[PDB]
Ligand binder design. Structure first.
Ligand code: HEC
Ligand code: HEC
Lengths: 135, 135
C-alpha cells in the first residue's frame, strides 16, 4: 500500500495526537496533581508514547505531503527535508527520552517520573520549534 | 483540566487511526508481501497496538461525546452505553489478542505472526460491528 499523501498526513497527525493524550495523562498525575497518582496508568501512558516514538514515523514523511490535508492541512515546514541531520538528531533524542520515560514509569517513583517526563516534553518541543508551523 | 467532549472524540479517533496505520504495516509484511518482512518493524508496529489497547480508552467515553466532532463527527453508536458487560468482554479480548500479537512479533515466527494478526483483526471488527457507524 503506497499510501496516498493525505493518508500519510492523517496517520502522522493521529500518531502525534495520540501521544498528546497520553502525555496529558502523565501531566495531570505527576506535574499538576489534578488526577490521583497511579503507577499503572502512568506506566500505560508512558508505554504508548515510547511505542509510537519507536514506530518509525519517518516512513510518513515525503515532500509531496507538504501543505496536504490529513485531518487538517499539514503543519509540516519544508526545511524538514533540507535539515535532514537535524531531524535525525532530534528524532533519535526523542526515542531515547521516550524509552527512558517508560523505564522510569515502570519503576513508579513519582519524582523520577516527573523529571524524565520533563525531558520528554523538551524533546517534543525541540522538533516543533524547528519543523512545525504553530498555525 | 478535564477533557472537553470534542477532545475526547479527537483523542479516541487519533488512537484508533494510529493502530490502523500500524496494523497496515504488519498486513503489508506478513499478509500481502508488498513490504519486505522486517523483524524489528513488525514488532515495533505490534507494540504500538498493544500499548494503545492497554491505554485505558474507556476514559474517553461518555454520553456527552455522542455526535460530537473531533477530527470528524463521532461514529460512536449510542447502544454502547447500554452494553457495559459486552464492551468489557470485547475490550478485554482485544487486550488479550493485542498482547499476544506483541509477544509473537518479538519471537519472530512469521506464520504465527500472520495467525495472531488475524485474531487481532477479528477483535477490531467485533467492536466496530456493534458500536461504530460504518462508512
Ligand atoms: C519531530 C521529530 C517531532 C517530534 C519528536 C514530535 N513532534 Fe509533534 N508534530 C511534529 C510535526 C511535524 C507535526 C505536524 C504534523 C502535520 O502533518 O501536520 C506535529 C504535530 C503534533 C501535534 C498535532 C497533530 C495533529 O493532530 O494535527 C501534536 C498534538 C503533537 N505534535 C504533539 C507532540 C508530542 C506530545 C510529542 C512528544 C511526546 C511530539 N509531538 C513529538 C513533529 C514532531
Ligand atoms: C471497541 C472497544 C473498539 C475496538 C477494540 C477497536 N475499535 Fe476502532 N473504533 C471504535 C469506535 C467506537 C470508533 C469510532 C470513534 C469515534 O468517536 O468516531 C472507532 C473508529 C476507528 C477508526 C477511525 C477513527 C477516525 O480516524 O475517525 C479506525 C481507523 C479504527 N477504529 C481502527 C481500529 C483498529 C485497527 C482496531 C484494532 C486494532 C480497532 N479500531 C479496535 C471502536 C473500537
Amino acid at each position: 500500500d503506497a499510501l496516498k499523501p493525505e493518508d500519510k498526513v492523517k496517520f502522522r497527525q493521529a500518531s502525534y495526537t495520540t501521544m498528546a493524550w497520553n502525555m496529558g495523562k502523565i501531566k495531570a498525575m505527576v506535574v499538576d496533581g489534578t488526577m490521583p497518582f497511579s503507577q499503572t496508568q502512568v506506566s500505560a501512558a508512558a508505554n504508548v508514547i515510547a511505542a509510537i516514538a519507536n514506530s518509525g514515523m519517518g516512513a510518513l514523511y515525503s515532500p509531496d505531503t507538504l501543505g496536504v490535508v490529513g485531518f487538517k492541512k499539514s503543519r509540516l515546514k519544508e526545511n524538514f527535508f533540507q535539515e535532514q541531520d537535524e531531524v535525525r538528531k532530534i528524532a533519535t533524542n526523542f526515542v531515547e527520552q521516550a524509552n527512558k520515560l517508560a523505564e522510569v514509569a515502570a519503576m513508579g517513583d513519582k519524582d523520577e517520573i516527573k523529571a524524565q517526563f520533563g525531558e520528554v516534553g523538551k524533546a517534543c518541543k525541540a522538533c516543533h520549534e524547528k519543523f512545525r508551523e504553530e498555525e
